[PDB]
Scaffold this active site. Structure first.
Site, PDB file in Angstrom:
ATOM      1  N   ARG A  99      24.781 -18.496 -31.252  1.00  0.00           N
ATOM      2  CA  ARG A  99      23.363 -18.520 -31.632  1.00  0.00           C
ATOM      3  C   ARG A  99      22.601 -17.246 -31.266  1.00  0.00           C
ATOM      4  O   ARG A  99      23.156 -16.324 -30.667  1.00  0.00           O
ATOM      5  CB  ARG A  99      22.673 -19.730 -30.981  1.00  0.00           C
ATOM      6  CG  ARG A  99      22.871 -19.822 -29.467  1.00  0.00           C
ATOM      7  CD  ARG A  99      22.323 -21.126 -28.886  1.00  0.00           C
ATOM      8  NE  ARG A  99      22.643 -21.287 -27.468  1.00  0.00           N
ATOM      9  CZ  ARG A  99      22.215 -20.479 -26.501  1.00  0.00           C
ATOM     10  NH1 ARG A  99      21.443 -19.440 -26.794  1.00  0.00           N
ATOM     11  NH2 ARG A  99      22.562 -20.704 -25.238  1.00  0.00           N
ATOM     12  N   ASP A 119      33.939 -20.997 -21.206  1.00  0.00           N
ATOM     13  CA  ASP A 119      32.857 -20.876 -20.233  1.00  0.00           C
ATOM     14  C   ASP A 119      32.847 -19.492 -19.592  1.00  0.00           C
ATOM     15  O   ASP A 119      33.780 -19.123 -18.870  1.00  0.00           O
ATOM     16  CB  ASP A 119      33.042 -21.958 -19.161  1.00  0.00           C
ATOM     17  CG  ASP A 119      31.839 -22.125 -18.266  1.00  0.00           C
ATOM     18  OD1 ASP A 119      31.082 -21.151 -18.064  1.00  0.00           O
ATOM     19  OD2 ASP A 119      31.674 -23.247 -17.732  1.00  0.00           O
ATOM     20  N   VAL A 120      31.786 -18.737 -19.865  1.00  0.00           N
ATOM     21  CA  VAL A 120      31.616 -17.386 -19.345  1.00  0.00           C
ATOM     22  C   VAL A 120      31.609 -17.351 -17.804  1.00  0.00           C
ATOM     23  O   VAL A 120      31.856 -16.305 -17.206  1.00  0.00           O
ATOM     24  CB  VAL A 120      30.305 -16.763 -19.898  1.00  0.00           C
ATOM     25  CG1 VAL A 120      29.107 -17.543 -19.394  1.00  0.00           C
ATOM     26  CG2 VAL A 120      30.210 -15.302 -19.511  1.00  0.00           C
ATOM     27  N   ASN A 140      26.304 -10.868 -23.775  1.00  0.00           N
ATOM     28  CA  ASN A 140      25.079 -11.415 -24.323  1.00  0.00           C
ATOM     29  C   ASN A 140      24.730 -12.742 -23.668  1.00  0.00           C
ATOM     30  O   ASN A 140      23.593 -12.941 -23.227  1.00  0.00           O
ATOM     31  CB  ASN A 140      25.229 -11.585 -25.841  1.00  0.00           C
ATOM     32  CG  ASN A 140      24.062 -12.319 -26.476  1.00  0.00           C
ATOM     33  OD1 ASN A 140      24.203 -13.463 -26.910  1.00  0.00           O
ATOM     34  ND2 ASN A 140      22.909 -11.672 -26.533  1.00  0.00           N
ATOM     35  N   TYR A 174      15.742 -16.860 -13.931  1.00  0.00           N
ATOM     36  CA  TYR A 174      15.972 -15.987 -15.069  1.00  0.00           C
ATOM     37  C   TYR A 174      15.772 -14.513 -14.722  1.00  0.00           C
ATOM     38  O   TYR A 174      16.612 -13.683 -15.053  1.00  0.00           O
ATOM     39  CB  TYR A 174      15.053 -16.349 -16.228  1.00  0.00           C
ATOM     40  CG  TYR A 174      15.401 -15.610 -17.492  1.00  0.00           C
ATOM     41  CD1 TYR A 174      16.501 -15.991 -18.268  1.00  0.00           C
ATOM     42  CD2 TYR A 174      14.652 -14.503 -17.896  1.00  0.00           C
ATOM     43  CE1 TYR A 174      16.839 -15.289 -19.418  1.00  0.00           C
ATOM     44  CE2 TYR A 174      14.981 -13.792 -19.044  1.00  0.00           C
ATOM     45  CZ  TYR A 174      16.075 -14.191 -19.801  1.00  0.00           C
ATOM     46  OH  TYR A 174      16.383 -13.498 -20.950  1.00  0.00           O
ATOM     47  N   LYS A 179      18.498 -11.408 -14.700  1.00  0.00           N
ATOM     48  CA  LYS A 179      18.318 -10.259 -15.564  1.00  0.00           C
ATOM     49  C   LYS A 179      18.138  -8.950 -14.793  1.00  0.00           C
ATOM     50  O   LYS A 179      18.596  -7.905 -15.238  1.00  0.00           O
ATOM     51  CB  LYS A 179      17.158 -10.522 -16.521  1.00  0.00           C
ATOM     52  CG  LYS A 179      17.520 -11.557 -17.577  1.00  0.00           C
ATOM     53  CD  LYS A 179      18.705 -11.041 -18.393  1.00  0.00           C
ATOM     54  CE  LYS A 179      19.195 -12.055 -19.409  1.00  0.00           C
ATOM     55  NZ  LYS A 179      20.274 -11.448 -20.240  1.00  0.00           N
TER      56      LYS A 179
HETATM   57 CO   LIG Z   1      26.452 -19.945 -26.976  1.00  0.00          CO
END
Ligand SMILES: [Co+2]
Ligand SMILES: [Co+2]
Lengths: 207, 213
Positions: free
Chosen positions: A12, A55-56, A82, A147, A151
């Protein structure tokens, strides 16, 4: 012969737009994503792409993904970190589990991407690692504790990594969006074709 | 004399942490000494009467819960928290193991989060308080081998920034104390931490930057 590129969070948003763009540009892309349902549909849209649900956060899934890229395309030329999720709640209301979900996915995930990708890039004589910055700039905002932490952390990770891999012909480039997903996707494309000589380390897009 | 505040300090057994403990205690603040080295904590606790030796690991919510509670039982309250815990492993990014990476990030970054999570409620109990974060140059300047260290130090500012915006309405001031851009003694940082704590209330300071003079 454009180069095999691995992309996380490919099902997505920016990930998908990037996947679609690179594929339409002649790149042989690997699609890493947690959402199997969406990935399955995208795998049939971008015929030729390598759908890699996983799973990253898991180092095991990273080993399999990188190995899969080399087995299907014979090599890995680039990695696009990403994958990025969020949980917006006051810092003191976040649970450890929520904190970890964001940090492990956004930050730990990128670290693992780099760790497992570098060895494959080196075998190709080098390559590119692109990291997607915060979709809300680099300014703190309420409810963004986890978050922002992930980042900002990402930038520290990328900065150090860039210096580490620079002599091994591996370019670490940050694409910082902080409009439309198709826009960031364009920025990623530029980072993969323009640089090459390992000079550009950061591309920023207007808010 | 005997009512300046109760401050919990992490990484209190050495460097900045210890320097902050000695100063704050000398200035009348009740202090809780949190660190992993129990022997050193005990030794430092002996040099400061009333000082509460709180051995524990900032990575464990369990130790934070017990630490904050120990603070409230010994001093009747918690007035402030100072995040100074830290560990370091430097080496090429890809050569770092997932284990070495978690050690750094859980201790330096997750540890501050857990610290904010467990200290705030105790601060909301008394109507407010202060959370001081000791920053690092590694929070803005990347360097070879610093993958995990820089990441945890950069992330700390992200956490801290959003934290001050989330807690300011509850009268909880999140203030950062960090070095300049381009030697800084542990006692100098302790002094800055001292100010951040004792200052009038009205659109106070959110950050204090220091540098060797
Ligand atoms: Co995804
Ligand atoms: Co210790």
């Amino acid at each position: 012969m454009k180069g095999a590129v691995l992309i996380t969070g490919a099902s997505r948003g920016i990930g998908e737009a990037t996947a679609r763009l690179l594929h339409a540009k002649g790149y042989r892309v690997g699609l890493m994503a947690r959402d199997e349902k969406r990935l399955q549909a995208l795998a049939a849209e971008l015929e030729g792409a390598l759908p890699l649900p996983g799973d990253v956060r898991e180092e095991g899934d990273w080993a399999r993904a990188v190995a899969a890229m080399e087995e299907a395309f014979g090599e890995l030329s680039a990695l696009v970190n990403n994958a990025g999720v969020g949980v917006m709640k006051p810092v003191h209301e976040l649970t450890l589990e929520e904190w970890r979900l964001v940090l492990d996915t956004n930050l730990t995930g990128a670290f693992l991407g780099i760790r497992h990708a570098v060895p494959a890039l080196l075998r190709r004589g080098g390559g590119t690692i692109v990291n997607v910055g915060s979709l809300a700039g680099k300014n703190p905002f309420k409810g963004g504790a986890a978050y922002n932490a992930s980042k900002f952390g990402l930038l520290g990770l990328a900065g150090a990594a860039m210096l580490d891999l620079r002599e091994a012909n591996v370019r670490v480039v940050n694409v910082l969006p902080g409009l439309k997903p198709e826009d960031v996707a364009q920025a990623v494309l530029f980072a993969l074709e323009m640089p090459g000589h390992a000079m550009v380390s950061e591309i920023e897009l207007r808010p």
